[PDB]
PDB file of C-alpha atoms and ligand atoms in Angstrom:
ATOM      1  CA  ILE A   1     101.741  70.812  76.531  1.00 56.64           C
ATOM      2  CA  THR A   2     100.334  67.504  77.770  1.00 54.55           C
ATOM      3  CA  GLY A   3     101.536  66.440  81.198  1.00 53.20           C
ATOM      4  CA  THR A   4     100.876  65.925  84.894  1.00 56.13           C
ATOM      5  CA  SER A   5      99.464  68.824  86.911  1.00 58.36           C
ATOM      6  CA  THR A   6     101.543  69.685  89.959  1.00 54.87           C
ATOM      7  CA  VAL A   7     102.500  72.540  92.271  1.00 55.52           C
ATOM      8  CA  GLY A   8     105.808  74.363  92.403  1.00 58.18           C
ATOM      9  CA  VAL A   9     107.203  77.075  94.646  1.00 58.97           C
ATOM     10  CA  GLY A  10     109.006  80.324  93.951  1.00 57.47           C
ATOM     11  CA  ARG A  11     109.607  83.949  94.869  1.00 59.33           C
ATOM     12  CA  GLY A  12     108.010  86.926  93.170  1.00 58.86           C
ATOM     13  CA  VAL A  13     109.397  90.325  92.205  1.00 60.69           C
ATOM     14  CA  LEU A  14     108.942  91.735  95.716  1.00 60.34           C
ATOM     15  CA  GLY A  15     110.680  88.738  97.291  1.00 61.53           C
ATOM     16  CA  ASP A  16     107.558  86.999  98.591  1.00 59.47           C
ATOM     17  CA  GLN A  17     107.217  83.215  98.421  1.00 61.23           C
ATOM     18  CA  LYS A  18     104.186  81.660  96.746  1.00 65.48           C
ATOM     19  CA  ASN A  19     102.994  78.356  95.319  1.00 64.66           C
ATOM     20  CA  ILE A  20     102.241  78.176  91.598  1.00 69.69           C
ATOM     21  CA  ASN A  21     100.425  75.633  89.432  1.00 70.27           C
ATOM     22  CA  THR A  22     102.723  73.928  86.932  1.00 67.97           C
ATOM     23  CA  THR A  23     102.692  70.996  84.514  1.00 64.92           C
ATOM     24  CA  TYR A  24     105.249  68.196  84.443  1.00 65.79           C
ATOM     25  CA  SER A  25     106.500  66.622  81.213  1.00 66.95           C
ATOM     26  CA  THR A  26     110.284  66.115  81.325  1.00 64.64           C
ATOM     27  CA  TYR A  27     110.494  69.743  82.453  1.00 67.02           C
ATOM     28  CA  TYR A  28     108.146  71.636  84.763  1.00 70.10           C
ATOM     29  CA  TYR A  29     106.250  74.259  82.770  1.00 73.18           C
ATOM     30  CA  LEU A  30     104.410  77.379  83.846  1.00 70.17           C
ATOM     31  CA  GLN A  31     101.104  75.948  82.693  1.00 69.52           C
ATOM     32  CA  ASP A  32      98.184  76.030  85.126  1.00 74.65           C
ATOM     33  CA  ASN A  33      95.552  73.442  84.173  1.00 74.78           C
ATOM     34  CA  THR A  34      93.274  74.184  87.130  1.00 76.32           C
ATOM     35  CA  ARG A  35      91.729  77.314  85.627  1.00 73.96           C
ATOM     36  CA  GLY A  36      89.650  77.181  82.454  1.00 74.42           C
ATOM     37  CA  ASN A  37      91.563  76.119  79.360  1.00 74.65           C
ATOM     38  CA  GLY A  38      94.741  77.009  81.227  1.00 72.45           C
ATOM     39  CA  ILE A  39      97.100  79.831  82.132  1.00 73.88           C
ATOM     40  CA  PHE A  40     100.385  79.862  80.205  1.00 74.70           C
ATOM     41  CA  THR A  41     103.444  81.984  80.927  1.00 73.64           C
ATOM     42  CA  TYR A  42     106.222  82.486  78.363  1.00 69.04           C
ATOM     43  CA  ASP A  43     109.821  83.722  78.321  1.00 68.03           C
ATOM     44  CA  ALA A  44     110.354  86.462  75.697  1.00 67.50           C
ATOM     45  CA  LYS A  45     114.108  86.354  76.427  1.00 68.86           C
ATOM     46  CA  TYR A  46     114.618  90.132  76.124  1.00 69.55           C
ATOM     47  CA  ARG A  47     113.371  90.039  72.507  1.00 71.59           C
ATOM     48  CA  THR A  48     110.185  91.502  71.030  1.00 71.41           C
ATOM     49  CA  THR A  49     109.037  88.361  69.229  1.00 70.85           C
ATOM     50  CA  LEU A  50     105.880  86.944  70.803  1.00 71.73           C
ATOM     51  CA  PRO A  51     104.946  84.899  72.654  1.00 71.08           C
ATOM     52  CA  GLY A  52     108.405  83.403  73.058  1.00 67.50           C
ATOM     53  CA  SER A  53     108.924  79.983  74.647  1.00 69.54           C
ATOM     54  CA  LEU A  54     106.640  78.340  77.217  1.00 69.01           C
ATOM     55  CA  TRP A  55     108.469  78.704  80.529  1.00 69.93           C
ATOM     56  CA  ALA A  56     110.372  75.516  81.355  1.00 69.81           C
ATOM     57  CA  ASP A  57     112.141  74.760  84.629  1.00 70.21           C
ATOM     58  CA  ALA A  58     114.175  71.700  85.617  1.00 69.31           C
ATOM     59  CA  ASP A  59     113.198  71.337  89.281  1.00 66.32           C
ATOM     60  CA  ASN A  60     109.839  73.068  89.887  1.00 66.69           C
ATOM     61  CA  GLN A  61     111.571  75.608  92.158  1.00 66.69           C
ATOM     62  CA  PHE A  62     111.550  79.225  90.971  1.00 68.17           C
ATOM     63  CA  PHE A  63     113.892  81.208  93.228  1.00 68.57           C
ATOM     64  CA  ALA A  64     116.248  82.675  90.599  1.00 70.64           C
ATOM     65  CA  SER A  65     116.065  86.422  89.995  1.00 68.83           C
ATOM     66  CA  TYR A  66     115.278  85.686  86.335  1.00 66.64           C
ATOM     67  CA  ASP A  67     112.249  83.642  87.474  1.00 69.23           C
ATOM     68  CA  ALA A  68     110.606  86.379  89.572  1.00 68.84           C
ATOM     69  CA  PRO A  69     108.607  88.165  86.831  1.00 69.33           C
ATOM     70  CA  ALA A  70     107.310  84.829  85.526  1.00 68.06           C
ATOM     71  CA  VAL A  71     106.216  83.669  88.975  1.00 67.15           C
ATOM     72  CA  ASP A  72     104.149  86.810  89.525  1.00 66.90           C
ATOM     73  CA  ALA A  73     102.680  87.013  86.022  1.00 64.49           C
ATOM     74  CA  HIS A  74     101.589  83.394  86.358  1.00 63.27           C
ATOM     75  CA  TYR A  75     100.271  83.715  89.904  1.00 63.94           C
ATOM     76  CA  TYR A  76      98.446  87.020  89.515  1.00 63.30           C
ATOM     77  CA  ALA A  77      96.793  85.922  86.274  1.00 64.87           C
ATOM     78  CA  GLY A  78      95.370  83.087  88.359  1.00 65.08           C
ATOM     79  CA  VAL A  79      94.106  85.429  91.080  1.00 62.45           C
ATOM     80  CA  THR A  80      92.474  87.650  88.468  1.00 63.12           C
ATOM     81  CA  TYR A  81      90.809  84.631  86.848  1.00 63.38           C
ATOM     82  CA  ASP A  82      89.468  83.667  90.291  1.00 64.23           C
ATOM     83  CA  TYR A  83      88.107  87.165  90.896  1.00 62.53           C
ATOM     84  CA  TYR A  84      86.084  87.222  87.685  1.00 62.35           C
ATOM     85  CA  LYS A  85      84.833  83.676  88.194  1.00 64.12           C
ATOM     86  CA  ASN A  86      83.911  83.894  91.880  1.00 65.82           C
ATOM     87  CA  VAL A  87      82.607  87.461  91.989  1.00 67.86           C
ATOM     88  CA  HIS A  88      81.096  87.990  88.532  1.00 65.12           C
ATOM     89  CA  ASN A  89      80.506  84.412  87.381  1.00 66.59           C
ATOM     90  CA  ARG A  90      82.629  85.067  84.299  1.00 65.75           C
ATOM     91  CA  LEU A  91      84.812  82.272  82.911  1.00 66.39           C
ATOM     92  CA  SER A  92      88.050  83.899  81.731  1.00 68.00           C
ATOM     93  CA  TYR A  93      88.083  87.040  79.590  1.00 69.10           C
ATOM     94  CA  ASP A  94      85.836  85.778  76.783  1.00 74.12           C
ATOM     95  CA  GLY A  95      83.306  84.145  79.085  1.00 75.22           C
ATOM     96  CA  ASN A  96      84.151  80.729  77.669  1.00 73.89           C
ATOM     97  CA  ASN A  97      87.349  79.829  79.544  1.00 73.23           C
ATOM     98  CA  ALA A  98      89.779  81.112  76.916  1.00 73.23           C
ATOM     99  CA  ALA A  99      93.406  80.278  77.696  1.00 72.93           C
ATOM    100  CA  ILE A 100      95.290  83.152  79.316  1.00 74.10           C
ATOM    101  CA  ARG A 101      98.802  83.779  77.989  1.00 73.59           C
ATOM    102  CA  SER A 102     101.487  86.131  79.321  1.00 71.79           C
ATOM    103  CA  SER A 103     105.049  86.805  78.183  1.00 71.98           C
ATOM    104  CA  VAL A 104     107.662  88.272  80.523  1.00 73.02           C
ATOM    105  CA  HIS A 105     111.160  89.683  79.948  1.00 73.06           C
ATOM    106  CA  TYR A 106     109.848  91.503  76.880  1.00 76.13           C
ATOM    107  CA  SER A 107     112.553  93.664  75.253  1.00 77.66           C
ATOM    108  CA  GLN A 108     115.271  95.387  77.319  1.00 76.82           C
ATOM    109  CA  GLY A 109     114.584  97.939  80.048  1.00 74.52           C
ATOM    110  CA  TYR A 110     110.991  98.184  78.848  1.00 73.88           C
ATOM    111  CA  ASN A 111     108.926 100.421  81.148  1.00 73.61           C
ATOM    112  CA  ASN A 112     105.509  99.140  80.187  1.00 71.26           C
ATOM    113  CA  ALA A 113     103.065  96.226  80.098  1.00 66.97           C
ATOM    114  CA  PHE A 114     100.095  95.695  77.805  1.00 66.89           C
ATOM    115  CA  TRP A 115      97.367  93.513  76.338  1.00 71.52           C
ATOM    116  CA  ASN A 116      97.977  93.144  72.601  1.00 69.81           C
ATOM    117  CA  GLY A 117      94.602  91.717  71.630  1.00 71.84           C
ATOM    118  CA  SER A 118      95.812  88.141  72.066  1.00 71.84           C
ATOM    119  CA  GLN A 119      97.957  88.043  75.210  1.00 74.40           C
ATOM    120  CA  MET A 120      99.536  90.024  78.037  1.00 74.62           C
ATOM    121  CA  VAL A 121     103.104  91.325  77.747  1.00 76.66           C
ATOM    122  CA  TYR A 122     105.367  92.546  80.567  1.00 78.46           C
ATOM    123  CA  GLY A 123     108.596  94.507  80.421  1.00 77.61           C
ATOM    124  CA  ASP A 124     111.251  94.296  83.147  1.00 79.52           C
ATOM    125  CA  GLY A 125     111.456  98.052  83.615  1.00 78.14           C
ATOM    126  CA  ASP A 126     114.742  99.966  83.706  1.00 77.52           C
ATOM    127  CA  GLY A 127     115.207  99.531  87.451  1.00 80.11           C
ATOM    128  CA  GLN A 128     114.698 103.249  88.068  1.00 79.17           C
ATOM    129  CA  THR A 129     111.212 104.114  86.841  1.00 79.66           C
ATOM    130  CA  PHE A 130     109.903 100.550  87.107  1.00 79.76           C
ATOM    131  CA  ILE A 131     110.897  97.104  88.332  1.00 82.14           C
ATOM    132  CA  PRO A 132     109.341  94.085  86.512  1.00 83.64           C
ATOM    133  CA  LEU A 133     105.734  95.142  85.944  1.00 83.12           C
ATOM    134  CA  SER A 134     104.144  91.770  86.691  1.00 83.07           C
ATOM    135  CA  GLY A 135     105.063  92.412  90.320  1.00 80.61           C
ATOM    136  CA  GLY A 136     102.004  94.617  90.661  1.00 80.11           C
ATOM    137  CA  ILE A 137      98.683  92.838  91.050  1.00 80.03           C
ATOM    138  CA  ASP A 138      96.774  95.954  89.997  1.00 79.24           C
ATOM    139  CA  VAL A 139      98.923  96.077  86.852  1.00 78.43           C
ATOM    140  CA  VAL A 140      98.211  92.441  85.952  1.00 76.66           C
ATOM    141  CA  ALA A 141      94.486  92.829  86.622  1.00 75.87           C
ATOM    142  CA  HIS A 142      94.537  96.107  84.668  1.00 74.85           C
ATOM    143  CA  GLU A 143      95.875  94.256  81.614  1.00 76.27           C
ATOM    144  CA  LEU A 144      93.567  91.243  81.845  1.00 74.74           C
ATOM    145  CA  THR A 145      90.618  93.595  82.215  1.00 73.38           C
ATOM    146  CA  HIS A 146      91.507  95.093  78.811  1.00 76.21           C
ATOM    147  CA  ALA A 147      90.863  91.597  77.444  1.00 77.10           C
ATOM    148  CA  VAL A 148      87.462  91.524  79.152  1.00 76.74           C
ATOM    149  CA  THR A 149      86.588  94.905  77.661  1.00 80.13           C
ATOM    150  CA  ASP A 150      87.690  93.742  74.204  1.00 77.55           C
ATOM    151  CA  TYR A 151      85.239  90.834  74.328  1.00 79.48           C
ATOM    152  CA  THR A 152      82.366  92.866  75.732  1.00 79.40           C
ATOM    153  CA  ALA A 153      81.894  96.614  75.248  1.00 77.41           C
ATOM    154  CA  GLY A 154      84.789  96.827  72.789  1.00 76.22           C
ATOM    155  CA  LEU A 155      85.506 100.440  73.733  1.00 78.24           C
ATOM    156  CA  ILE A 156      87.658 102.061  71.038  1.00 80.80           C
ATOM    157  CA  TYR A 157      91.049 103.128  72.408  1.00 79.72           C
ATOM    158  CA  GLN A 158      90.707 106.812  71.593  1.00 78.58           C
ATOM    159  CA  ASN A 159      89.253 109.962  73.147  1.00 80.66           C
ATOM    160  CA  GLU A 160      86.452 109.489  75.680  1.00 79.93           C
ATOM    161  CA  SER A 161      85.735 105.860  74.810  1.00 79.42           C
ATOM    162  CA  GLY A 162      89.419 105.132  75.364  1.00 82.53           C
ATOM    163  CA  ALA A 163      89.458 106.995  78.669  1.00 81.96           C
ATOM    164  CA  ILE A 164      86.561 104.810  79.819  1.00 83.47           C
ATOM    165  CA  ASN A 165      88.437 101.734  78.597  1.00 81.36           C
ATOM    166  CA  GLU A 166      91.389 102.830  80.734  1.00 79.55           C
ATOM    167  CA  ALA A 167      89.301 103.671  83.805  1.00 81.39           C
ATOM    168  CA  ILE A 168      87.584 100.287  83.668  1.00 81.68           C
ATOM    169  CA  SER A 169      90.999  98.605  83.808  1.00 79.67           C
ATOM    170  CA  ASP A 170      92.101 100.777  86.747  1.00 80.50           C
ATOM    171  CA  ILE A 171      88.811 100.168  88.559  1.00 83.28           C
ATOM    172  CA  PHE A 172      88.896  96.386  88.268  1.00 82.97           C
ATOM    173  CA  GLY A 173      92.654  96.342  88.747  1.00 79.74           C
ATOM    174  CA  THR A 174      92.000  97.939  92.124  1.00 76.71           C
ATOM    175  CA  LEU A 175      89.057  95.688  92.965  1.00 76.41           C
ATOM    176  CA  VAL A 176      91.248  92.649  92.318  1.00 75.78           C
ATOM    177  CA  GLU A 177      93.940  94.139  94.548  1.00 77.11           C
ATOM    178  CA  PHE A 178      91.329  94.370  97.318  1.00 78.94           C
ATOM    179  CA  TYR A 179      90.071  90.868  96.512  1.00 81.64           C
ATOM    180  CA  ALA A 180      93.568  89.456  97.066  1.00 78.18           C
ATOM    181  CA  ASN A 181      93.929  91.679 100.132  1.00 82.12           C
ATOM    182  CA  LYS A 182      97.498  92.548  99.109  1.00 82.84           C
ATOM    183  CA  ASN A 183      98.124  95.886 100.862  1.00 83.28           C
ATOM    184  CA  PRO A 184      95.063  97.285  99.027  1.00 82.50           C
ATOM    185  CA  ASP A 185      94.694 100.952  98.139  1.00 81.13           C
ATOM    186  CA  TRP A 186      93.168 103.219  95.504  1.00 82.38           C
ATOM    187  CA  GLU A 187      96.529 103.960  93.883  1.00 83.96           C
ATOM    188  CA  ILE A 188      97.714 102.417  90.611  1.00 84.11           C
ATOM    189  CA  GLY A 189     101.033 100.613  90.189  1.00 81.98           C
ATOM    190  CA  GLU A 190     102.526 101.558  93.547  1.00 83.74           C
ATOM    191  CA  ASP A 191     104.270  98.195  94.001  1.00 85.08           C
ATOM    192  CA  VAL A 192     106.435  98.427  90.883  1.00 83.78           C
ATOM    193  CA  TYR A 193     106.806 102.173  90.353  1.00 86.17           C
ATOM    194  CA  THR A 194     109.985 104.063  91.322  1.00 84.17           C
ATOM    195  CA  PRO A 195     111.644 101.606  93.746  1.00 84.00           C
ATOM    196  CA  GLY A 196     113.790 104.464  95.032  1.00 82.76           C
ATOM    197  CA  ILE A 197     110.779 106.564  96.037  1.00 84.08           C
ATOM    198  CA  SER A 198     108.212 105.377  98.574  1.00 84.45           C
ATOM    199  CA  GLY A 199     104.626 106.573  98.807  1.00 86.66           C
ATOM    200  CA  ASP A 200     104.050 107.335  95.130  1.00 81.41           C
ATOM    201  CA  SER A 201     102.331 105.634  92.187  1.00 82.45           C
ATOM    202  CA  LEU A 202     101.653 106.129  88.478  1.00 81.23           C
ATOM    203  CA  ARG A 203      98.045 107.225  88.971  1.00 79.12           C
ATOM    204  CA  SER A 204      95.718 107.832  91.902  1.00 79.35           C
ATOM    205  CA  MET A 205      91.991 107.092  91.923  1.00 79.11           C
ATOM    206  CA  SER A 206      91.375 108.828  95.254  1.00 79.09           C
ATOM    207  CA  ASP A 207      93.065 112.027  94.071  1.00 78.13           C
ATOM    208  CA  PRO A 208      94.012 111.971  90.358  1.00 75.28           C
ATOM    209  CA  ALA A 209      95.188 115.583  90.595  1.00 76.59           C
ATOM    210  CA  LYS A 210      98.067 114.496  92.825  1.00 73.81           C
ATOM    211  CA  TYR A 211      99.850 113.470  89.628  1.00 72.17           C
ATOM    212  CA  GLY A 212      98.393 116.129  87.362  1.00 74.61           C
ATOM    213  CA  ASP A 213      95.425 114.160  86.055  1.00 75.10           C
ATOM    214  CA  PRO A 214      91.976 115.814  85.852  1.00 77.89           C
ATOM    215  CA  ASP A 215      89.388 115.153  88.568  1.00 76.36           C
ATOM    216  CA  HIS A 216      86.557 117.092  86.923  1.00 72.33           C
ATOM    217  CA  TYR A 217      85.166 117.200  83.378  1.00 73.60           C
ATOM    218  CA  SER A 218      85.955 120.913  83.126  1.00 77.40           C
ATOM    219  CA  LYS A 219      89.658 120.040  83.321  1.00 80.80           C
ATOM    220  CA  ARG A 220      89.598 117.325  80.654  1.00 80.00           C
ATOM    221  CA  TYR A 221      92.461 117.125  78.167  1.00 82.92           C
ATOM    222  CA  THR A 222      91.342 117.940  74.628  1.00 85.18           C
ATOM    223  CA  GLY A 223      94.626 117.445  72.781  1.00 90.84           C
ATOM    224  CA  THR A 224      95.812 114.627  70.522  1.00 91.83           C
ATOM    225  CA  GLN A 225      98.582 113.160  72.685  1.00 94.43           C
ATOM    226  CA  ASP A 226      98.098 109.765  74.329  1.00 96.79           C
ATOM    227  CA  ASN A 227      95.359 108.830  71.847  1.00100.59           C
ATOM    228  CA  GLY A 228      93.339 111.807  73.015  1.00 97.75           C
ATOM    229  CA  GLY A 229      94.390 111.531  76.648  1.00 97.69           C
ATOM    230  CA  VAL A 230      93.164 108.023  77.440  1.00 95.30           C
ATOM    231  CA  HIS A 231      95.490 107.731  80.460  1.00 94.90           C
ATOM    232  CA  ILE A 232      94.814 111.335  81.453  1.00 96.32           C
ATOM    233  CA  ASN A 233      91.041 111.740  81.255  1.00 95.91           C
ATOM    234  CA  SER A 234      90.583 108.350  82.897  1.00 95.51           C
ATOM    235  CA  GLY A 235      91.148 110.289  86.106  1.00 94.53           C
ATOM    236  CA  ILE A 236      87.681 111.822  85.829  1.00 94.66           C
ATOM    237  CA  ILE A 237      86.040 108.400  85.788  1.00 94.66           C
ATOM    238  CA  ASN A 238      88.419 106.929  88.373  1.00 97.19           C
ATOM    239  CA  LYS A 239      87.478 109.731  90.773  1.00 95.10           C
ATOM    240  CA  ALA A 240      83.782 109.065  90.159  1.00 94.93           C
ATOM    241  CA  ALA A 241      84.308 105.363  90.900  1.00 98.66           C
ATOM    242  CA  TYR A 242      86.248 106.172  94.071  1.00101.35           C
ATOM    243  CA  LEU A 243      83.431 108.447  95.256  1.00101.88           C
ATOM    244  CA  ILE A 244      80.749 105.860  94.532  1.00 98.39           C
ATOM    245  CA  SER A 245      82.582 103.335  96.699  1.00 99.24           C
ATOM    246  CA  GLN A 246      84.100 105.459  99.461  1.00 95.43           C
ATOM    247  CA  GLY A 247      81.974 108.596  99.364  1.00 96.87           C
ATOM    248  CA  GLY A 248      83.088 112.134 100.096  1.00 93.98           C
ATOM    249  CA  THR A 249      82.560 115.730  99.053  1.00 90.99           C
ATOM    250  CA  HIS A 250      84.164 116.811  95.791  1.00 94.00           C
ATOM    251  CA  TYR A 251      83.830 120.352  94.413  1.00 96.89           C
ATOM    252  CA  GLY A 252      80.996 120.980  96.855  1.00 99.05           C
ATOM    253  CA  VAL A 253      79.002 117.889  95.889  1.00 98.84           C
ATOM    254  CA  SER A 254      78.488 115.247  98.590  1.00 97.84           C
ATOM    255  CA  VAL A 255      78.364 111.537  97.786  1.00 94.55           C
ATOM    256  CA  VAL A 256      77.327 108.721 100.122  1.00 92.38           C
ATOM    257  CA  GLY A 257      79.599 105.730  99.560  1.00 92.79           C
ATOM    258  CA  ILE A 258      78.012 102.351  98.840  1.00 90.52           C
ATOM    259  CA  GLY A 259      81.117 100.168  99.034  1.00 90.80           C
ATOM    260  CA  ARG A 260      83.462  98.288  96.714  1.00 92.07           C
ATOM    261  CA  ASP A 261      81.275  95.239  96.146  1.00 93.36           C
ATOM    262  CA  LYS A 262      78.391  97.290  94.782  1.00 94.06           C
ATOM    263  CA  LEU A 263      80.769  99.463  92.744  1.00 92.77           C
ATOM    264  CA  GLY A 264      82.020  96.285  91.099  1.00 92.52           C
ATOM    265  CA  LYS A 265      78.533  94.959  90.390  1.00 92.76           C
ATOM    266  CA  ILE A 266      77.353  98.255  88.918  1.00 92.67           C
ATOM    267  CA  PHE A 267      80.340  98.735  86.615  1.00 93.78           C
ATOM    268  CA  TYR A 268      80.547  95.103  85.518  1.00 95.25           C
ATOM    269  CA  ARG A 269      76.897  95.222  84.479  1.00 96.81           C
ATOM    270  CA  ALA A 270      77.429  98.520  82.671  1.00 93.71           C
ATOM    271  CA  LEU A 271      80.441  97.075  80.849  1.00 92.36           C
ATOM    272  CA  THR A 272      78.761  93.827  79.803  1.00 93.61           C
ATOM    273  CA  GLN A 273      75.210  94.997  79.090  1.00 92.21           C
ATOM    274  CA  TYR A 274      75.108  98.684  78.176  1.00 94.36           C
ATOM    275  CA  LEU A 275      78.405 100.088  76.909  1.00 95.65           C
ATOM    276  CA  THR A 276      79.312 100.057  73.216  1.00 95.51           C
ATOM    277  CA  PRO A 277      82.525 100.710  71.244  1.00 95.57           C
ATOM    278  CA  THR A 278      81.845 104.453  70.911  1.00 97.58           C
ATOM    279  CA  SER A 279      80.356 105.218  74.332  1.00 98.02           C
ATOM    280  CA  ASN A 280      81.338 108.600  75.774  1.00 94.36           C
ATOM    281  CA  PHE A 281      81.331 109.849  79.385  1.00 96.00           C
ATOM    282  CA  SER A 282      77.695 110.964  79.295  1.00 96.57           C
ATOM    283  CA  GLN A 283      76.675 107.532  78.034  1.00101.03           C
ATOM    284  CA  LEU A 284      78.741 105.852  80.748  1.00101.01           C
ATOM    285  CA  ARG A 285      76.774 107.842  83.315  1.00 98.36           C
ATOM    286  CA  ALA A 286      73.504 106.657  81.779  1.00 95.90           C
ATOM    287  CA  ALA A 287      74.792 103.080  81.673  1.00 94.98           C
ATOM    288  CA  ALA A 288      75.864 103.183  85.324  1.00 95.79           C
ATOM    289  CA  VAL A 289      72.559 104.678  86.451  1.00 98.24           C
ATOM    290  CA  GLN A 290      70.597 102.058  84.512  1.00 96.63           C
ATOM    291  CA  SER A 291      72.769  99.265  85.919  1.00 97.71           C
ATOM    292  CA  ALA A 292      72.230 100.467  89.484  1.00 95.80           C
ATOM    293  CA  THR A 293      68.518 100.720  88.702  1.00 98.04           C
ATOM    294  CA  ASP A 294      68.373  97.116  87.460  1.00 94.76           C
ATOM    295  CA  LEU A 295      70.136  95.850  90.566  1.00 92.36           C
ATOM    296  CA  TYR A 296      68.795  98.019  93.385  1.00 94.82           C
ATOM    297  CA  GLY A 297      65.739  99.929  92.184  1.00 94.85           C
ATOM    298  CA  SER A 298      65.185 103.420  90.782  1.00 93.35           C
ATOM    299  CA  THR A 299      64.603 104.916  94.244  1.00 98.04           C
ATOM    300  CA  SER A 300      67.574 103.193  95.884  1.00 97.86           C
ATOM    301  CA  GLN A 301      70.488 104.830  97.685  1.00 98.57           C
ATOM    302  CA  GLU A 302      72.749 103.097  95.165  1.00 96.86           C
ATOM    303  CA  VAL A 303      71.209 104.939  92.211  1.00 94.93           C
ATOM    304  CA  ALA A 304      71.356 108.204  94.161  1.00 94.83           C
ATOM    305  CA  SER A 305      75.072 107.784  94.867  1.00 93.57           C
ATOM    306  CA  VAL A 306      75.903 107.021  91.245  1.00 92.20           C
ATOM    307  CA  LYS A 307      74.159 110.217  90.132  1.00 91.52           C
ATOM    308  CA  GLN A 308      75.878 112.278  92.835  1.00 87.42           C
ATOM    309  CA  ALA A 309      79.293 110.886  91.912  1.00 88.86           C
ATOM    310  CA  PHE A 310      78.975 111.817  88.259  1.00 88.13           C
ATOM    311  CA  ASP A 311      77.556 115.229  89.228  1.00 86.83           C
ATOM    312  CA  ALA A 312      80.637 115.734  91.406  1.00 85.23           C
ATOM    313  CA  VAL A 313      83.017 115.215  88.477  1.00 83.84           C
ATOM    314  CA  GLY A 314      80.892 117.293  86.114  1.00 82.89           C
ATOM    315  CA  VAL A 315      79.604 114.508  83.874  1.00 82.23           C
ATOM    316  CA  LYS A 316      75.998 115.087  82.816  1.00 81.46           C
TER     317      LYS A 316
HETATM  318 CA1   CA B   1     114.323  75.985  89.026  1.00 79.59          CA
HETATM  319 CA1   CA B   2      98.697  98.267  97.125  1.00 76.30          CA
HETATM  320 CA1   CA B   3      97.181  99.684  93.919  1.00 78.44          CA
HETATM  321 CA1   CA B   4     107.824 104.225  94.278  1.00 78.92          CA
HETATM  322 ZN1   ZN B   5      95.434 100.194  80.115  1.00 76.75          ZN
END
């Protein structure tokens, strides 16, 4: 809507206070006009109809429990937009400042969040397995990254191409978590997963096997469940990414870490310049090697580490 840009204050899912960009026009709306064509957050009111109603508040103060998921979805979408703009010089997910829209309070006790090709959607969780999913910055960045992939490589959500699609979202979800410096780690969804159990997460990039996911190509899932194991086989790529950044010895193969910044540059270039809708793991390796070559030279340590990382997880 048309109005005056202002700043409100509220508390997120984890109880932390933060300032959020809003728009004033009779009511204060969760509409951030400071980033691209705007960031809009909607209330799905426990229904499944999308997007719902643009979030309206009477006093620009968001401290009600019902407000929490909206505050975080709105705020973290902004942080993610900043990451892509400041680090990769990319304006929003389409590269042309497309408006970012998110709906919270989707359905009842919904233990999931997703990008539906047009917007982000967040469930509130059942309170046991998950608390409102927008409370996790790696979750929000994971979803917005799916939008980036859709407008670039367009990786099909099935089999190996889908596993890469998933890994890319976990990789950048984690890089954004580090960017915001919010208790960063290489785990996925730890802030909103199982509130009654500390120390766990949905997936782990440092050790995918901790939760039963494969950490080597020889252990890849070949069934039909989960669209061919897109959330399972992503562990093979996540481990490779972790090794490239942090280094280590995996299955007898030693990798010299080159850091998170370079990991981000290498994968962003691979995603935007070399990957295609049907790319498989072997092609991702080639794309990553070529990207590192473009940026640091064929005889660089960076290229060496990328090769070692993929060798470590058995991807030739
Ligand atoms: Ca209020
Ligand atoms: Ca964390
Ligand atoms: Ca995390
Ligand atoms: Ca937990
Ligand atoms: Zn995903």
